[PDB]
Amino acid sequence: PKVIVFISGSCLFGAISRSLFKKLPIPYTVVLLILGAILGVVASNVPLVEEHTRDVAHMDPHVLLQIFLPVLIFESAFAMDVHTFMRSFSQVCILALFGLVVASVLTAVLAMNLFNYNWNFSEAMMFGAIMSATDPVAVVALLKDLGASKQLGTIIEGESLLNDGCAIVIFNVFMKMVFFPQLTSTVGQNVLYFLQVAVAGPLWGYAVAKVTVFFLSHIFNDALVEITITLAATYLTYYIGDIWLEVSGVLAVVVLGLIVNAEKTSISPEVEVFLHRFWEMLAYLANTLIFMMVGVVVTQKALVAVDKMDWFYLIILYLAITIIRGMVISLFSPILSRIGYGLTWRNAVIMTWGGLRGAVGLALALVVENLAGNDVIGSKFLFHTAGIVVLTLVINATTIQTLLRILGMSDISIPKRLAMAGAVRRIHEGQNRTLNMLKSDRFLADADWDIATAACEISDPYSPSPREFADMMEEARLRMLKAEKISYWKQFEHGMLAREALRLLVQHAEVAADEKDQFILVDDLKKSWQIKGIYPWLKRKLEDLISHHMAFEVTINIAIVLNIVPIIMEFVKIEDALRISNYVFFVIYAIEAIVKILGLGRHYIVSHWNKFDAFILVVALRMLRLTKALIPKLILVVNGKINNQLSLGYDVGKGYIIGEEEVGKIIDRMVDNKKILRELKHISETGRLQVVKELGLLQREHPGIAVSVKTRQAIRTILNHSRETIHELQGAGLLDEMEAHKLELTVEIKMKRLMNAPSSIPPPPPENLLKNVSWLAGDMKLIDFIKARASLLHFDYGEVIVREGDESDGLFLIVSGLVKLYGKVFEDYLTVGNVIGEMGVLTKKPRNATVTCETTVQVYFITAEDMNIAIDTFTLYPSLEYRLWRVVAIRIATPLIMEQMAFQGWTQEKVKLHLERGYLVDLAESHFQFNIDATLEDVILINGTAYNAHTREEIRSPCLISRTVHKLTFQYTATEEPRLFVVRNA
Amino acid sequence: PKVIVFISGSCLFGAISRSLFKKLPIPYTVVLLILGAILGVVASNVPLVEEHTRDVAHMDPHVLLQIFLPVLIFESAFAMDVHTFMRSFSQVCILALFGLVVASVLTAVLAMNLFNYNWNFSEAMMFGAIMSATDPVAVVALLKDLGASKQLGTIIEGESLLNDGCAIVIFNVFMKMVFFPQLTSTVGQNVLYFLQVAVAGPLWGYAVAKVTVFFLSHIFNDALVEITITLAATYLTYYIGDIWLEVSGVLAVVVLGLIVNAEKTSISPEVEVFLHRFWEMLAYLANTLIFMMVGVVVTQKALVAVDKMDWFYLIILYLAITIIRGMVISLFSPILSRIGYGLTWRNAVIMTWGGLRGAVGLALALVVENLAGNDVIGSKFLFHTAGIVVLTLVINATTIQTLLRILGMSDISIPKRLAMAGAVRRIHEGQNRTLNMLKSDRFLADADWDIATAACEISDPYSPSPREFADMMEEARLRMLKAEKISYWKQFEHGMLAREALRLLVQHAEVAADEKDQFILVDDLKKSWQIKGIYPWLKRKLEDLISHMAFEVTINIAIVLNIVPIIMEFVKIEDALRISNYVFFVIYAIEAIVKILGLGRHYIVSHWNKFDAFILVVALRMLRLTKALIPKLILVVNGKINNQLSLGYDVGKGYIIGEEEVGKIIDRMVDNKKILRELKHISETGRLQVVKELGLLQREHPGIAVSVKTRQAIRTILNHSRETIHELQGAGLLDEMEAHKLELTVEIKMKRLMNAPSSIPPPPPENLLKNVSWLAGDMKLIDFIKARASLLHFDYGEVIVREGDESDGLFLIVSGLVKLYGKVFEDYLTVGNVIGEMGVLTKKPRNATVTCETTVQVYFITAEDMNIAIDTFTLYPSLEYRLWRVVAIRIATPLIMEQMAFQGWTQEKVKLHLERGYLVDLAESHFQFNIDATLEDVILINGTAYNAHTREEIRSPCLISRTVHKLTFQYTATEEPRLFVVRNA
């Protein structure tokens, strides 16, 4: 058998038709089919080409059924976006299953009473099933090429996959019924077989996928072991499926592919991209081979047994299948709308014409033709399937192209056009200035400028009247929504916000912008983060109440595993085996009894588990012993299952509140209408307060998960900033490349190890919180002195702690609860770990706020006189006074520098770093004389009065002072010591 | 046959031993071997495991010889650094070949007269050949694990590859001689076979590699076609080599692997990394399988036919092979030193112990054991080879680790330690300030700070007296060299300098720093860029003098058609012959008609047509194809010279810019006059010599230089556009996928540029006059200047203009090289460099002298015409503003550079910084300027400044600091003051 030339020519023709058929809208598979037809007619004429093509044109059905199908289905599974697929699992699954069933039955009942073949009922079901299969890849490809709607692509791909799997299953059972009639089909074993293929396959695939993921989670700095392990696991599942029920192996591999593709943490990205490329290449090879094979086979023998009526019938069949495909979706759209997963007019219209028949139908046609022998049914099946495929693959493509061009999907929004125009203009200006600069140097003044300026051009690829006040409302709304949307992207760019939270926030913003006079709401986000109130909490609640050395328990657990072997023996030369078994059982009994004795020795009390162990010993059922180890793993999986959702909710809330703060700061210099400004500020502040209260309560309800999430966020931010500093240091040429590479490798290893951190860290004790105050930066004498006299207080809900119009009794520290701060317009909520009244004790001013308790609160109280003696006792350079005033100054100075220079490109994190780099300066060594230089950028006066010499102008406080002034002097005031905050350059 | 469980268990054991045997120095293959031994003894005891392992333990020699070897050799070829390998081709090739030959012969003559087997000569030759193999991946692995040197790793890898490639051939021929004695070995056909396996194989591999590369160079935006094409090409070459010579196939695939790995432009990086990973995985699978197989086989049957003396002999054999391996290098080191490719003491010592036997010897032992049948030679061969491998794989590893620890290779230089300490300190400070900032916000005040601060720590992984004049001298020298290297790294980081040029420059800097009191020289760089003077220039010189159009295309096609009858000539037989005759006749007529047509086109017979008429009269179509053969030879010579010229130009430009920066920075480092004078003298002498040499090199042949300059300009513009796109994407102004498609367009443009034509013809002088910086496409200005622009020609050795004279007018060098000398001030100007802009702008007498170093063509414009053209035009983008802006930035770049030459400011950054701003006039400001905070730097070009609250005179040209805030100017008839201010974004 000679086969090499056929495969090499197939690869060559596939590459040629991929390269030279790209601008055309129709796919290259039609060219492949006609090339196969030419090869078939040539081989029918010339005998040598017939000898060279017979070895592959007519090959066994078993190799086709066992290699060409599972690879295609597994690639279709691997090319999925799993999350958007599971977002609409129920809708797509019910639609695919019911539509497949009704389409197959209708096509079978059409083929039975139409035509003149006098076909039976099983042949009708086989014919109906082999053309209900659709193609996932092509539809998603040309939907992504024009229209840009990911929901439609994901639902159509999921429908195609769920159609292909069920079509394969039903075709297989009906072929087994029709071609090998020796089998028996009693109801009991048949329903057992259906239950087996329904439930047993996917469970096995899921189990092996979980085991493989768990094994891969422990591999560090090894990109070659995991690839081999993954391939071996995939083949092992396929082999178990093959030796098992054949119709279930495809289900097992698609389940494993979905599970493996869903997981993205324990697998490094390089392994993922390599696996994607590998399976894509294998599927491409299979597709090319099957198309050429079916072209040759349909041309050689299928087209010499047809008539005029056989050409007449396929048009009717195509019309019928299109009509039923449209009718199913038309009938099922209202139910989907009523339940809450409805579609629209345009999506239904495009999904009616989005059904392309792929290569799986060709494979099943080849199988039925090869099994049919030298009969006519194989020729009819192959001819009809090839005709339907070659019709739809061009007709539906052209129709869907025209439909997209004639509807609103192939349209570009005006803001997108404006953004593209601005980007193109900026690129053109940058290129022009770069060229103008580069024309001036004396080393590159000879190059041909026409070629250089013509071979690098960038072109755009896209080409009191109520009405007045309402128009102001509309433009204000649209501009505010634009600002929020750009802020949520700036947050993601620095790596602070998660991808899913960003997607949800931008989707909500777009939904709010689309609807007229509709602001962004908080109830939808409340639903987004309220998912914790779900039955998993009830599993946790029941499971926690369900509930000498430690090595004894581990050894006993192991002992139980040993007992499993005798069990198997019981389940079961023979004499010797039996004898061994009795001895083994006796030994196990002895061990158990000894274990019980040891337990009694360690403890004489009797418990429920002790009573159960005594009953077990009295019996001499080892499965009842493993629950002791089963329970903690169930706890550990429920912990992560709730931790993921809590993390997502916290990220969404924090992103929304920070973006809203920035947007509220940016509106102040846009429009100058008092009423609209008042309304916008009112809405923003109401949303902010409600969101912060809800997040505070959510954190308070269960603290361990919140503590774990906060720790993970802090660690991630610190590591990201360290990586950025390493990259900046490498870019300046201070160190060699490979040292930076190994440092980045260490950082990446740290991040990967963090990704598998334990969840639900227990909350710290109050002393740990008191040891982590910002100004109490590990000063042993200060820590000891403050811990010596720190009083602890407890207040019930509904009481008032302190009130304004009173002297500063002392600073407070919230160590448990949620406190409402209300005063003079000024409303906010403070939580655990937030000091109260620093400026009250520093400036010796009366209180300017009122404190109320919204839950049971525990606070830390320190007297002000003790603080005063501790601060006038210590006079070191890093004194507590400097730390306190620096913290208060940066806290009071961030909003001022933000609102003064809120130009396009300044965020919260950047301003915080900018103010963090600088440091406070005193007037003792400057003799009350300051001169503003160019090294320092911004200078802000916190409190006091300023003066000059050549202008002599009073300066109110707190105020940032611009660069107009030059010399600053200060008088001697007993009631106030003036302070300044200056920030210098690098 | 059941084979699944064995392969699955092999994969599992390979993964387990890779994971759990990483900190240990010895490789995991010893664990694999002992696991195979345990499996063998278990299968010898239990019958079921014997049934499950017999199907794979004893497999055919043909599948082993035809799959397991070529994959290993091709992976070894693919895992090479080709450029550093070809840097020392001759040394490693002669060393590997001669050492292989002498070691094999000595081992054969040892095995013949030692032992007691009474072996023949063929068996001794095979025995010597099967243990001369070497493991490439292990040596490079343990070398790169420590410091080592790229040179040592590359030479040892090349030697290992060549050793395996020749050992396979010699083993193949001797096995064919010894096991199938029916073959005939007459001298003629034997030497024909040797010539075939020497020359015909690599030529075929090279031809297919070139064809595949040419086909892949035309594929754009398709990452799946090229992978399949590459795999199909590799298999096709393997198949042709396998059916052809069954030994030379390994030579064909190693040549193809080297050629494909060398090429890196027509193949996208994703395809390259995918191919690397694929072949690495296949080789890993093969290695694991062969080690487990040989463990099982050696344990089951090889160890039951040995005695005390059979345990005694292998130690002697190991000592002998180590001794001869050392002796070969010891003898051949002086010759290598004499020719110019010598090694050192430490490299020879480490390369003596760097010979690790790999899996290839195991495969050949399995082949000879399986072919030997139920005899004793197979058992002896397998036992000896397994013993040698299991000895060396631990003994040489431990010995080389101890040797590296006991010599200077495993040492870290003091500057490296200082740099690591500084980087760790900076990282620690950054982490501390980030943590201090993050402890303050009110949304993250609850996280456990101990865990956060303990789970992110970064730790360092490394743990008149001439004496005083001498120590300051050396400290200045190392400071210069450090500045030079960091300047080169800064140049490379922006993407301006090539990788090879950067490597060469840093290597030269390190070499100069290692030698005492040795500055960086220019003669070595002169040798680096003088490679253009080589015999390829002579091929070009002879080839150029050798030297509707659709007719010629048709003529070539006709020649191909004529080839068909020729084939038959070499060859229903009657029918075939008749058809052939008919075709021949027909051909003889189309060619005659084409010749008649040519005659009707050109009456006189052409020089080629003179012999074409004889060709027609004969009725030998190979002589016709030279017409199309010649231009492709011209193109390939053009490319081969273009690469070298580009490398030389890059090296020169990088060195001169780095030297300028290094000369600028040192001015505020040390305060001794004599050393400053000497240092500046050396720097300026080197700069002038390099610039003169580069000018002459550009002048000698202009087309290649023009092409190189155009490529550089296009690359820089595209890189800056990509940077702007990335910055725009980072600010959230546009969505991600639009930026992705723009970057895809930019990448497509870069890839299309990479295949640009070479040797662009030089532009005409009018094109150069149309591309002056201030003549930015102003139609009236261009027409007026082209109306009166005089053109002059001056011979070598004359003086164009001299100082102490009125400004006659600005000049423009359109051809030649001109020396500008005057008042200390010496430089060289080339084509496209305007002369005397400040002379005509400020109406000042000349301050320079011009001499001609070659024949020069210049453009002369009278100053009166410039004056009337400049007082006629008064638009906002006037020529006066452009001229003064260009002169001001040119005169202001060095001042702002030298004033603020802090660590982190380069030429390109300062040029962009000064380019962003623009000049301001005093007409609308009423001679009043007040400095705001938006603008950064302000420089007074010419004139005198005045104040109000200080009233201080300011000399020119001078950048004015942040001391006075109000500037006023008087009305001066002899001078109009100007300022250059640069503002913020």
The string of DSSP letters for B20-57 reads TTSSSSS-THHHHHHHHHHHHHHHHH-HHHHHHHHHHH
A469 in any annotated domain: no
Torsion angle of the four alpha carbons B272, B276, B279, B281, in this order, in degrees rounded to the nearest 10: -140
Range of the domain at A542: 480-547+625-701
Distance separating the N- and C-terminal Cα atoms of chain A: 76
A-B contacts at Cβ under 8 angstroms: 282
Amino acid in the structure at residue B334? P
Question: How far does Cα A521 stand from its chain's mean position?
Answer: 23
A425 in any annotated domain: yes
Distance from CA of B659 to the nearest CA of A (A): 15
Nearest to B728 among A229, A426, A963 (CB): A426
Asked whether the beta carbons of A397 and A26 are under 8 A apart, the reply is yes
Distance from CA of A225 to the nearest CA of B (A): 6
Distance from CA of B869 to the nearest CA of A (A): 23
Among A408, A701, A346, which residue's Cα sits nearest to residue A532?
A: A701
Count Cβ atoms within 10 A of the Cβ of residue B925 and give its class: 0-12 exposed, 13-18 middle, 19 or more buried: middle
Alpha-carbon distances, residue A791 vs A766, A859, B120, B652 (angstroms): 12, 9, 99, 75
Count Cβ atoms within 10 A of the Cβ of residue A516 and give its class: 0-12 exposed, 13-18 middle, 19 or more buried: exposed
What the block records as the tokens of A719 is 């590591």
**Which residue on chain A is closest to B7 by alpha carbon?**
A232
Separation CA A899–CA A902 (nearest Å): 5
Mutation test of the interface with chain B: which of A217, A277, A911, choosing the one with the most B Cβ atoms within 10 A? A277
A280 neighbourhood in chain B, CB within 8 Å:
224
What the block records as the tokens of B348 is 């020879």
CB contact under 8 A, A722 and B451: no
Asked whether the beta carbons of B333 and B342 are under 8 A apart, the reply is yes
Among A147, A165, A510, which residue's Cα sits nearest to residue A351?
A: A147
Nearest to A834 among B445, B718, B745 (CB): B445
Q: After which residues is chain B broken (C to N over 2.5 A)?
A: 463, 547, 571, 619, 823
CB contact under 8 A, A717 and B434: yes
**Resolution value in angstroms:** 3.7
Q: Is the dihedral of CA A144, A148, A150, A155 positive or negative?
A: negative
Residues A263 and A324 in one domain: yes
Residues B782 and B917 in one domain: no
Alpha-carbon distances, residue B629 vs A165, B210, B543, B606, B612 (angstroms): 58, 17, 11, 19, 17
CB contact under 8 A, A444 and B713: yes
Separation CA B984–CA B380 (nearest Å): 83
Residues B75 and B155 in one domain: yes
Q: Which residues pair with A946 in a beta bridge?
A: A955
Q: Which residues pair with A327 in a beta bridge?
A: none
**Which residue on chain B is closest to A917 by alpha carbon?**
B433
CB contact under 8 A, A440 and B745: no
The contacts of residue A419 (CB under 8 Å, 6+ apart) are B733, B734, B735, B738
Peptide bond into A703 cis (omega under 30): no
Count Cβ atoms within 10 A of the Cβ of residue A980 and give its class: 0-12 exposed, 13-18 middle, 19 or more buried: buried
Nearest to A905 among B14, B731, B746 (CB): B731
The string of DSSP letters for B362-376 reads HHHHHHHHHHH-SSS
Q: What angle do CA B41, B42, B45 make, to 5 degrees?
A: 90
CATH code of A360's domain = 1.20.1530.20
Tokens 């049914």 belong to residue: A377
CB contact under 8 A, A427 and B904: no
Distance from CA of B967 to the nearest CA of A (A): 15
Q: Phi and psi at residue A940, in whole multiples of 5°? A: -130, 130
B667 SS3 class: helix
Residue A763 DSSP label: P
Separation CA A563–CA A557 (nearest Å): 10
B665 in any annotated domain: no
Alpha-carbon distances, residue B208 vs A9, A986, B202 (angstroms): 17, 58, 10
CB contact under 8 A, B227 and A950: no
Among A895, A905, A985, which residue's Cα sits nearest to residue A938?
A: A985
Residues A92 and A204 in one domain: yes
Q: CB B641: neighbour CB atoms within 10 A?
A: 21
Distance from CA of A269 to the nearest CA of B (A): 13
Q: CB B389: neighbour CB atoms within 10 A?
A: 24
The contacts of residue A530 (CB under 8 Å, 6+ apart) are A649
A756 in any annotated domain: no
Separation CA A754–CA A723 (nearest Å): 15
Q: Which of A671, A686, A701 is the last residue of a domain?
A: A701
Residues B902 and B843 in one domain: no
**Which residue on chain B is closest to A484 by alpha carbon?**
B732
Amino acid in the structure at residue A272? E
Alpha carbons within 13 A on the beta-carbon side of A668: 12
Query: Solved how?
Result: cryo-EM
Among A839, A801, A805, A843, which residue's Cα sits nearest to residue A818?
A: A801
Separation CA A434–CA B912 (nearest Å): 8
Mutation test of the interface with chain B: which of A434, A735, A767, A891, choosing the one with the most B Cβ atoms within 10 A? A434
Amino acid in the structure at residue A790? A
Tally of domains within chain B: 4
Nearest to B962 among A227, A435, A933 (CB): A933
**Which residue on chain A is closest to B426 by alpha carbon?**
A725
Residue B199 DSSP label: I
The contacts of residue A508 (CB under 8 Å, 6+ apart) are A520, A524, A525
CB contact under 8 A, B456 and A722: yes
Q: Which of A358, A385, A406 is the last residue of a domain?
A: A406
**Which residue on chain A is closest to B14 by alpha carbon?**
A225
A829 SS3 class: strand
CB contact under 8 A, A732 and B904: yes
Asked whether the beta carbons of B205 and B236 are under 8 A apart, the reply is no
Separation CA A969–CA A954 (nearest Å): 11
Q: Which helix (H) or strand (E) holds A820?
A: strand A819-823
Question: How far does Cα A609 stand from its chain's mean position?
Answer: 43
Question: How far does Cα A759 stand from its chain's mean position?
Answer: 19
Alpha carbons within 13 A on the beta-carbon side of B576: 9
Separation CA B501–CA B715 (nearest Å): 17
Separation CA A304–CA A292 (nearest Å): 19
Question: How far does Cα B434 stand from its chain's mean position?
Answer: 40
Residue B628 falls in which region: left (phi positive, over 0), alpha (psi -120 to 50) or beta: alpha
Nearest to B222 among A18, A225, A768 (CB): A18
A754 neighbourhood in chain B, CB within 8 Å:
455
A649 SS3 class: helix
Separation CA B252–CA A849 (nearest Å): 86
- Sequence-ordered alpha helix ranges (H) in B407-498: 414-438, 449-454, 466-493
Q: Which helix (H) or strand (E) holds B713?
A: helix B702-730
Residues A511 and A563 in one domain: no
**Cα Dmax for chain B:** 115
Q: Please, what's the b/e burial string for B88-117 (b: 16 or more CB within 10 A of its CB; e: otherwise)?
A: beebbeebbeebbebbbebbbebbbeebee
What the block records as the tokens of B706 is 């023009």
A434 neighbourhood in chain B, CB within 8 Å:
716-717, 720-721
CB contact under 8 A, B730 and A277: no
CB contact under 8 A, B718 and A447: no
Asked whether the beta carbons of A388 and A315 are under 8 A apart, the reply is no
B917 in any annotated domain: yes
Count Cβ atoms within 10 A of the Cβ of residue B126 and give its class: 0-12 exposed, 13-18 middle, 19 or more buried: buried
Residues A291 and A161 in one domain: yes
Residues A294 and A359 in one domain: yes
Separation CA B111–CA B653 (nearest Å): 61
Q: Which residues pair with B958 in a beta bridge?
A: B940
* Radius of gyration for the alpha carbons in chain B, expressed in angstroms and rounded: 37
Among A22, A292, A12, A8, which residue's Cα sits nearest to residue B215?
A: A12
CB contact under 8 A, B721 and A434: yes
Distance separating the N- and C-terminal Cα atoms of chain B: 76
Among A661, A708, A713, which residue's Cα sits nearest to residue A684?
A: A661
> Residues of B within the annotated binding site for 3',5'-cyclic AMP?
836, 838-839, 846-847
Alpha-carbon distances, residue B921 vs B429, B885, B926 (angstroms): 47, 11, 10
Amino acid in the structure at residue A350? I
Separation CA A86–CA A106 (nearest Å): 30
Q: Which of A423, A440, A457 is the last residue of a domain?
A: A440
CB contact under 8 A, B445 and A714: no
Asked whether the beta carbons of A113 and A290 are under 8 A apart, the reply is no
Separation CA B620–CA B618 (nearest Å): 9
Among B381, B371, B392, B390, which residue's Cα sits nearest to residue B305?
A: B381
Alpha-carbon distances, residue A517 vs A422, A475, A514, A683 (angstroms): 28, 11, 9, 13
Asked whether the beta carbons of B255 and B76 are under 8 A apart, the reply is no
CB contact under 8 A, B742 and A833: no
Q: What is the 3-state secondary structure (H, E, C) of B739-794?
A: HHHHHHHHHHHHHHHHCCCCCCCCCCHHHHHCCCCCCCCCHHHHHHHHHHCEEEEE
Residues A896 and A964 in one domain: yes
B230 neighbourhood in chain A, CB within 8 Å:
none
A122 in any annotated domain: yes
Residues A345 and A310 in one domain: yes
Output helix, strand, coil percentages for chain A, rounded to the nearest 5: 70, 5, 25
CATH code of B791's domain = 2.60.120.10
Separation CA B525–CA B501 (nearest Å): 11
Alpha-carbon distances, residue A228 vs A263, B21, B56 (angstroms): 17, 18, 20
Nearest to A710 among B447, B455, B490 (CB): B447
What the block records as the tokens of A903 is 């130009």
Distance from CA of B678 to the nearest CA of A (A): 27
What the block records as the tokens of B916 is 């962003």
Residues B940 and B857 in one domain: no
What the block records as the tokens of B106 is 């000595």
Nearest to A934 among B734, B890, B962 (CB): B962
Residues A948 and A807 in one domain: no
Nearest to A718 among B452, B487, B760 (CB): B452
Distance from CA of A153 to the nearest CA of B (A): 17
Count Cβ atoms within 10 A of the Cβ of residue B787 and give its class: 0-12 exposed, 13-18 middle, 19 or more buried: exposed
B698 neighbourhood in chain A, CB within 8 Å:
446
A616 in any annotated domain: no
B866 in any annotated domain: yes
Q: Is the dihedral of CA B400, B402, B407, B408 positive or negative?
A: positive
Peptide bond into A958 cis (omega under 30): yes
The string of DSSP letters for B873-933 reads ---TT-HHHHHHHHHHHHHHHHHHHHHT--TT--HHHHHHHHHHSEEE-STTTTTEEE--S
What the block records as the tokens of B675 is 């050393």
Residues in chain B: 985
Distance from CA of A338 to the nearest CA of B (A): 34
Nearest to B431 among A427, A442, A718 (CB): A718
What the block records as the tokens of A412 is 């570009």
**Which residue on chain B is closest to A236 by alpha carbon?**
B8
B281 neighbourhood in chain A, CB within 8 Å:
224, 227-228
Q: Which helix (H) or strand (E) holds B582?
A: helix B573-601
Distance from CA of A231 to the nearest CA of B (A): 10
Nearest to B490 among A11, A456, A733 (CB): A733
Separation CA A529–CA A531 (nearest Å): 6
Among B967, B938, B941, which residue's Cα sits nearest to residue B952?
A: B967
Residues in chain A: 986
The contacts of residue A745 (CB under 8 Å, 6+ apart) are A221
Asked whether the beta carbons of B852 and B902 are under 8 A apart, the reply is no
